[PDB]
Paper text:
Integration of retroviral DNA by the viral integrase (IN) into cellular DNA is a necessary step for virus replication. The 3′ OH cleavage of blunt-ended viral DNA by IN yields intasomes with recessed ends, here termed the cleaved synaptic complex (CSC). We determined the structure of RSV octameric intasome stabilized by a HIV-1 IN strand transfer inhibitor using single particle cryo-electron microscopy.
Well-defined cryo-EM density was observed for both of the proximal IN dimers, all four CTDs of both distal (flanking) IN dimers, two viral DNAs, and the two MK-2048 molecules occupying the active sites of the inner catalytic IN molecules. IN residues downstream from Ile269 were not discernable in the EM map. The NTDs associated with these CCDs were not modeled due to low-quality density in these regions. Weaker and less well-defined density compared to the rest of the complex suggested that the NTDs and CCDs of the distal IN dimers are highly flexible in the absence of target DNA. Notably, Arg263 from the CTD of a distal IN subunit, which bridges between the CCD and CTD of the catalytic IN molecule as part of the CIC, interacts with the Gln151 side chain as well.
Residue numbers in the entry:
A (entry chain E), B (entry chain A): 1 to 269
C (entry chain B): 57 to 269
D (entry chain F): 56 to 269
E (entry chain C): 54 to 214, 221 to 269
F (entry chain D): 52 to 214, 221 to 269
G (entry chain G), H (entry chain H): 52 to 212, 221 to 269
The structure:
Amino acid sequence: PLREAKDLHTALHIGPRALSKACNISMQQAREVVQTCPHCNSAPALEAGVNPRGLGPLQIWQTDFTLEPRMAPRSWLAVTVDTASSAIVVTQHGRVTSVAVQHHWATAIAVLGRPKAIKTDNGSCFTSKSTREWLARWGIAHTTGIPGNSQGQAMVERANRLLKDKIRVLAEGDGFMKRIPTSKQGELLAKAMYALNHFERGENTKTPIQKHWRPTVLTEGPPVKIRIETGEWEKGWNVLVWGRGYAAVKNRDTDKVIWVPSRKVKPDI
Amino acid sequence: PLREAKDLHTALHIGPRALSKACNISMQQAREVVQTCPHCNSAPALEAGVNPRGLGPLQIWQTDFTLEPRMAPRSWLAVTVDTASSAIVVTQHGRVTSVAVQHHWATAIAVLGRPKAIKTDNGSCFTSKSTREWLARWGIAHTTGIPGNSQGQAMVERANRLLKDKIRVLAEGDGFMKRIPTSKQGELLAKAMYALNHFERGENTKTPIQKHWRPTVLTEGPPVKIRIETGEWEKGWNVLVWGRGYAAVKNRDTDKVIWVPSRKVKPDI
Amino acid sequence: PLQIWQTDFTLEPRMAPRSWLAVTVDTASSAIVVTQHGRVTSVAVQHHWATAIAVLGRPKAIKTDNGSCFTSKSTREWLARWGIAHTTGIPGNSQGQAMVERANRLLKDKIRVLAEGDGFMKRIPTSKQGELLAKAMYALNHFERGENTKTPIQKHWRPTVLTEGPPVKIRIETGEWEKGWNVLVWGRGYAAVKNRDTDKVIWVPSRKVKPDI
Amino acid sequence: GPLQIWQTDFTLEPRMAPRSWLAVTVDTASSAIVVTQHGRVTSVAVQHHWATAIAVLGRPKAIKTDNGSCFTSKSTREWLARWGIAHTTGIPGNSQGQAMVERANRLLKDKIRVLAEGDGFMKRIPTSKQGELLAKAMYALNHFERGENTKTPIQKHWRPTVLTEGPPVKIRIETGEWEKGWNVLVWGRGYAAVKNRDTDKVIWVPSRKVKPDI
Amino acid sequence: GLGPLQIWQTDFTLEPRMAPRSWLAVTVDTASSAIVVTQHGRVTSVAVQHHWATAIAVLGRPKAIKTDNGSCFTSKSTREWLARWGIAHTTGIPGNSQGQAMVERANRLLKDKIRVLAEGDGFMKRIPTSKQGELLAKAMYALNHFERGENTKTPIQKHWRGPPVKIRIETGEWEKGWNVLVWGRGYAAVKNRDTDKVIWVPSRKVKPDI
Amino acid sequence: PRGLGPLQIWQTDFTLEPRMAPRSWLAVTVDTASSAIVVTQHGRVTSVAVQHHWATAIAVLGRPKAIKTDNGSCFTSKSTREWLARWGIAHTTGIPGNSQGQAMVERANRLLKDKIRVLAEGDGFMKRIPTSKQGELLAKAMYALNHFERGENTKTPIQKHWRGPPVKIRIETGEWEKGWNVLVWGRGYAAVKNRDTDKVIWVPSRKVKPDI
Amino acid sequence: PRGLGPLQIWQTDFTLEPRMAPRSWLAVTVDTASSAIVVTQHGRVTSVAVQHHWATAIAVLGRPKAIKTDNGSCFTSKSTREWLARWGIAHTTGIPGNSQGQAMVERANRLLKDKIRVLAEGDGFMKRIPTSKQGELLAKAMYALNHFERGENTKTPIQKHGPPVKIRIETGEWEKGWNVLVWGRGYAAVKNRDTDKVIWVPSRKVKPDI
Amino acid sequence: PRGLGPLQIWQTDFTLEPRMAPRSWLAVTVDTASSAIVVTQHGRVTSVAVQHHWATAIAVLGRPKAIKTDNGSCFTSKSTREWLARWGIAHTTGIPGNSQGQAMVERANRLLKDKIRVLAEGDGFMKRIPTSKQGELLAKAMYALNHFERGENTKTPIQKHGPPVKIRIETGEWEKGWNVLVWGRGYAAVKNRDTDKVIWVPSRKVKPDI
DNA sequence: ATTGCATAAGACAACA
DNA sequence: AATGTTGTCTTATGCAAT
DNA sequence: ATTGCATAAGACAACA
DNA sequence: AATGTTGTCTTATGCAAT
Ligand SMILES: CCN1C[C@H](C)n2c(c(O)c3c(=O)n(Cc4ccc(F)c(Cl)c4)nc(C(=O)NC)c32)C1=O
Ligand SMILES: CCN1C[C@H](C)n2c(c(O)c3c(=O)n(Cc4ccc(F)c(Cl)c4)nc(C(=O)NC)c32)C1=O
Ligand SMILES: [Mg+2]
Ligand SMILES: [Mg+2]
Ligand SMILES: [Mg+2]
Ligand SMILES: [Mg+2]
Ligand SMILES: [Zn+2]
Ligand SMILES: [Zn+2]
C-alpha cells in the first residue's frame, strides 16, 4: 500500500525511512515516492570541474597583487608564477598603476624568458589602455578570468600566500616584528625569491628552477581509466601529466589536451 | 654535517626535505634542526573540544531566534530544543521583547513539561530584568554561552535550520512562493511541529516524541578506550551514550559524567 | 488513548478581544488543548485541531456539535485529508459533549484563580493572555486533578524509562544468529552487546549484528 | 664547468639621473650578465645589489673585484663569509680582476644608449622607465647572442635541455626480486606507471611495489 | 536590414570594359547585399525588364523595387511588368543616404572586381566579344558566395535566412530565472529570463532548478 | 544515391525548349543533393555560353567541389579549362546520353518544359513569347521550383542548401523509449530533451542508457 | 594626599574599650602616609602605656621622623620626656582634635573598635571579650587591616610603608598579547598584558605563540 | 641551615626565665628561612598559653602551613592537636632536645636572655622586673633585636622575612622538572618549578614523571 | 608475533 | 572570456627489527 | 565468477 | 559564563543470486 504514503508525503513531506516504517512499505515504493516531490531534491548536485594549467615552461603565467604592511611605503608587490614549473617572480612599487606592471613584467621577462599567455583578474590599470597596447607591442596573449571570482587564477593566489608566509618568516626571524627599514627591503625581496625558486618545496624531487630550465614532458604516456560525461568510466585514453591535485589526459585519435581532476582519472588495468 | 644545514636554515628557512637533499643529510639532523626555528611552527595544533549535551529528558534546553520573511508581519519565531530527545517547540510573535520569550517558554512548558536549564545566547530582552525575575519565579536555571559565538547553542541553531527547511518546503509546496497569508500561519506552524516531532529523522529507529516520553538511559554500559589529555589512550572507563557525533563516558570510581568527542573514545578489547 | 476526541467553543469575557475559547479533550486520557480565536470560523477549528495534533498526535475520531463551522465543507475535507473521522452530535448531549463540558468548567475555574492570583480582576492584559492559557494547560495536563493517581500525561504517553537496547541476534561461531541478546551502544565498527541472562558485555563486529523479530 | 667565478664593478651612467651609480655582475663560465643601479655608494646599497644578483643567478664560488672601500669593508666581509663566497680583490682595473667586467661594461653602456635612442631618450630617461630599460637591456644581453656560437649565455649557464624521462627506479617482481631497467613517468595515487627501458613498455604498478634505483 | 527578399534597389551603371555595350544593369537587396547583373548594352524598357526578371530568377520574388526617376523605369512596359509581378516601385533622384546608396557602393565593388579579374586574365580596358559575359559572371560568383567584409556569413548566407539552473550571488542566496546557453568543461554562460542579459559564471556556483 | 552533400556535384546539359525561340538554345545546370536549378536561356550555344551559364549558376547557388558534364566539343574547350583553373574545380566526362548523371538532368529538363508551357498558357502566349517576358517566365518558374516543394516532398530545394546524442530513458514501466538528447549532463542525472515535444526534464543517471 | 614618604609624620591617641575589659584602654599608631597600625593594651591612662605603645610601634614599623599629638597631661610627664630625650624625635602640641594636628588616628580608633566588634561577633562574643582571646582577636584584626589592602589603591598599605596565546577577532586576524588564566573543557579566558582585562573565548578560537 | 623561603617553615620551644616570675613560662618561636623570633609570656605550661602564643604568631608573622615542634603534653593535647587542624597547620615534632631542629631555638633563647639582661641592667632594673615594667622591657629587648642587627649578617633576618612529566632536549636525555598547565594535541605548555618559565614543548618530547 | 619504523594517503587553510 | 591549489600536517599502514 | 542488491561509511551545508 | 550538529547524499563494500 503506497498511496497512504503518497498522501502522507504530499501533505507532510516525510523522509523515506519514516514513510517506510509508518505504512509497512519497503525499498522501491519509498525511494520513488520520495523522488516525486521536487522540493525534496533541489540542490544536491552542484557540478564542479576544476582545472587551470599550462603544459610546458613559458607557456602560461599568472598574476595577482599583494598588500604587505611590512614594506611601507612601497607595500604594493606584484606576483607572477610560471604554471609549468612554479617559478615565482615578485617586484615592488608604490601604486597599482600600469607602469608598475610594466616594470614587473619586464623584470620577469629578464629572469624567466618570454611566455605566451598571462591569466589573471581584471585590475584597474590592467585591462587599461597602456598595458594592453604595450602587451600587444611585446606580442603575448592576455586572457582575463571571470570578472569577480579571484579563483580562476588560484595558482598565483596560492603562491601569493606562500610568498607572504616566507617573507614574514624571514622578516620577523631577522629581528623586525612590525615593519622593515628601507635598507632591508632588497634583503627580504631577494631572499624570498632565492629561497622559493632554487630550493624545492614539499616532497617533490625537483627544484622549481631546474624544473623551469630542464623540464621533463612525456610524448606518449600510459593508458588510464577516465570519465566521459556519460556517467562513468571508459578506457582508451592516455595521461600526459598527473599532478598531486589534478591531471592532464590525451586522446589516442582526436589528440586533445584537456585538464581534468584526478578524481576524473584512474590507472588502466 | 649538520652545520651547513644550521646556517642555511637560520639564514634562509628551508623545508626539511630540501635541507636533507642540499647537504647530504638524513632523518634526525633534518627533523630536529627544522624544529629549532620557532617561526617554522607557530599555529599547527589548535585545540578543539566540542561537546554540549543533556543526559535525560527535561534536563537541558536551548534557545535561539529566527527571522522568517514568509511569516510577515509576525516574522519573529522563537526556537527551543530538548537536547536529550531532540524535540522542538517554536512560537510566533511580533518583536523580540521579553514578553514573547515569556509566552514561548510558557507554551513549551505546557507541551514538553518543565526542564532544569536553558542554555542560550545573550539576547537584549533575555538577560533582561523581567526575564530573569520571571525565570527565578518559575525556578529553573539559566546558563548563557560565551558572549559572541552563536555556536555553543549549536543544537538550537541546527534545529533552527532544519525548521526553516521544513517550513519553507511545506509553504512553497502548498502554492505560496513568496509569503503566507494570515490564514495559513497556524497551518505552517503546527504542521512543522507535527512533522518534526512525531516522525523520526534520518536513520534512527526512534521518534523524537517517544524518545522524549519513553527514553532509554543506561545505568552501567560497556568499557571503552579513551583520551586522558596525557597524549593517547587508556582503558578502565565506561560509556553512557555514544551518539554518532559525540559521546558521554563515565568513570568507574570517580563517577564523572563528561562529554567528549567520539574521536576520544573507541571500543574496549 | 488517541481514539476519540471532542471539541466545543465557549465564550470568555475577560479574554477581550479574542474571547472565544476552543477546547479539545481526549477520552482515555482527559488531556486538554486550548487556544484563542478572535471570532469563530470554519478555519479557526482547523487551526485549533492542527495545534492539538501537534501537541498530542493524530486521533482516530472527533465528536463535536452540529455548529456552523464544524459542519461547513472546509473542516470536512480537512479531516478527510488527514484521516480523522468526523462525527457530529447534538449541541449539549451527554453521550457526546459531557467531559468536554467538565473540562470547560475546570478551565474556567483555573483561569479565574490564576487571573486573580496574578493581580487581575476582570481584564487580563492583551500581552498576558497566552501566558495564562499555557499555565492552565500545564496545570491541567501535568498535575493530578482530585483523586487521580495519575496526571493526563502519564495515562496518555505511558512514560516508562526502559534501560536495555532492542532485542538483537549475533552471529554465533556456528554461523547461526542466536536471539536473546540486546545491544547497548553502537560505536565505530563495533556494537557492544549484553546477554539477557548472564549480563556480560562483549564487543562484536558490526557486520555480524542484526535485530531480533 | 659553469658557476665557478663571478666578477663585479660599478659604472657611472649620467644617462640615468639621479640614480647615477650602476652596478654590473658578470659570470665568467657563461657571461650571463646581471645589472642593477643604486643612487648612492655605501655598503648596504651595494649589498642590496649583490642580493638581487644572487637571487637572479644563484650562489657563486668566488667574486673577484677591485680594492674599493666597500668591496672589502667589514659589513660586506662578514656578510659574504656568512654566505660562503671566496672574496678576491686586486689592482683597481687589472686585466685579471676586470677582464670581462669592462667588456660587459662596454656592452651595457652600448645597449643602454641603443635602446634609449630606440624609444627616443637622449639626455636622461625619466625616473619611471629606467627599470624597464635595464630589464630589456639584460634580456637582450643574456638571452640574445652577441658572440658567434650556437649557445646563448642561458644555454651555457643553466644547461637547458628538454628531457623526456625522470629518475630511474627499480621495480620488484611478483617472485620477490627487484629489477632495474625501468623509469617512472607518472606518480598516480596508489599506482606508478613505469616504462621498460628497452621496449618502451609502460605498466601500471603499485606504490610499495616499486623502490628507487641507486 | 531585417529580412531578405523585401527591398530591391536596381540601378544602372557604365563600365568601359564591355564597350560598345558599356551600359550595365544591377539589382541590390539592402537586406542581403546580394547582387544580380545581366549584360545589356542599351538602356531600354526591354533591357530593364529582362535584368529585373533575371534578378528575380536568381535571388527570389520580391515585395518592392526601389529605383529613381529614370524614364525607362516608369514606362508603361515597366509599370505593367511590376503590376503583373505583384511588387512595388518607388522613384528617386537617386542619391539618398540611408537608401539608394548601397547599390552605388555595390557598383563600385562590381567595377573593381571585374577590373581585377580582367587584369588577372590579361585584359586592361577592352575585353573580347567572348569575354564580357564571362567576366561579369566570374565577378558575380566571386562576390556572391565568398564573404567580403568582416562577418562570419557570406552575402548569400546573408540572403534568405536551455534548462533552468539556480546561481549563487554575492550575499549567498540562490536565485532562479536563468538558463544555460553554452556549457563547456568548467564554465557556463547564464541568461536571465526577463532582462535576458548574459553573464558568465563558474560551474561550481550553479545548481539546477526542479 | 543522394546522400553525398549539397553544393558538391553539378550536372549540366543543353535541352532545346520549343518556346524560347528564336533565341532557341538553352543550357541547364542542376545539383544532385540540393535539387536547385538556375538557367539563363541564351540565344547561342558555345563554350563561352557554357561558361557564362556556369559562372552565373555558381554565383546563384554555391561553390561545388565538382561540376559534371557529358563529353563533347561543347564542354572540353580550352577556354573552359582556363575558367576551371581560374576556379580550380576538378572535372571528368562521360558518355553523351548515359544514365550515370544525366537521367535526373533530363527529368528536370522535361519539368522545365512543362512548367514553362503551363506558365505561357497562363499568360496568353501559346507557342512563342516576346523577347521581353522570357526572363519573367524564367523567374516565376525558378521561384516555383526552388522556394516551393515539388510534389509531396516536404523538403523544398531551399531546405537542402545549408543544413545531444540520442539516449533512451526509463519510465516507471521501465520502457526504454527513444527520443531524448542530453544538454547539460551531470554525475547524478541528466538534462534531456525530447526530439518533437522539445521539453526539458532532468532524469536520474540510473534511468538513462545510450541509443545505438 | 601629602607627597612625603612613610616613617615621617606620626599621629597618636588612646581609646576606651569596655569589650576588652577589665583591660579597657587601647592605643594605635598611624602614619599620615602609610596609615599602618600598631596596637597595645592597658586598663588605665599612664605615661608608661604610651611608652609601651611607642616601643611596640617603633619596633614593628621602624622609626618616626616626627610625631603630632594632643595636650594630654601624661604626655609631658617626666618619664616619657626622658624617654623621648633619649630617642631623638620631637614632640608637638595642639588644640585637642583639630583638622591639622589629629589627622586620621580618630578614624583609626573607630575602625579598630568596629573591626574588633565584628570579629567578636564572628567568633561569638557580644558583650565583652575576656582577657584570653584578646591577643588572638587583635592579631586577626591587625592582619586583616594591614596585610590586606583596604579601600582602593595601587599598592597595599604594607606595600606603601598564564602562557601567551593568540585569539581571533571578527576581522579574522590573530591578536598577540593574551595570557590564558583558566583552561576549561572547550572554553578559555584571556588577559591582555597591557589592558589586564579578561575576555572569554572558545578553545577552537585560540592558538598560542612559539 | 639557611632555609628555602619565608612563611613556610617554623620551629618553637619552651623557656623559663626566673626574673619574669611569676609569669616566667615563655613559649619561644622562630622561623627558619626568615629567622624571625617572637615570644609571649605566661606563668604555667598549658594548652591555653600555647594556643594564645600560636594565634599571636599567626598574625605577627603570617598564616602558617606546617610548624615543626618538640615533644610534650601541650602540643599533643586534644585542644592544641585539633587546633592545628583548625588552622590547617601540620606537625613534624621531634625529640625533646633533637639537635637537628632545636639547636637554633636554644641559641635564640640564649640570645634573648642575654639581650634582656644587658638592656635591663642598662636602664637600672637589675634582678627581677616588676609588674608594670615587664612589657616595656620585653619590648626593649625585642627592639634591640628587630631592626638594628642580628649579630653577624650583611643580610638581616627580618629584612628577608599540574602533574609532573619528563621532557626531551636535543641532547637526547629526558630531563625532569616540568609541569603542564595547558594541554594541546600537538604540544603542551610546561613550567619548571625553579625557573617558573612556561614554554610550549611538542607532545613527541614528553613522558610521564614516574 | 609486538613494537617501532619508513612511507604513503588523506585533511585543513587561506589568498583584498 | 577564460574552469582550485598544494605546502604542511596528521593518521594509517606495512616492513624491519627484537 | 559477474551483476545487482542491501547496507554501511563517509562528505557537504548552513543556522542574523 | 557556558565547548558543533546531523539530515541528506555519495561511495565503497560485501552478500546473494545467476
Ligand atoms: C580589484 C583587484 N582585485 C579584485 C578583488 C579585490 N580581489 C583581488 C584579489 O587579489 C583578491 C583576492 O586575492 N582574493 C582572495 C582569494 C579568495 C578566494 C580564493 F579562492 C582565492 Cl584563490 C583568492 N579575493 C578577492 C576578492 O575580491 N574577494 C574574495 C580579491 C584583486 O586584486
Ligand atoms: C543579538 C542576538 N544574536 C547574536 C547574533 C546576531 N547571532 C544570533 C544568532 O541567532 C546568530 C546566529 O544564528 N548565527 C548563525 C550561526 C553561525 C555559525 C554557527 F556555527 C552557528 Cl551554530 C550559527 N550567527 C550569529 C552571529 O552573530 N554571527 C555569525 C548570530 C543572535 O540572535
Ligand atoms: Mg588575487
Ligand atoms: Mg588580483
Ligand atoms: Mg542563534
Ligand atoms: Mg540568538
Ligand atoms: Zn517532498
Ligand atoms: Zn625556520
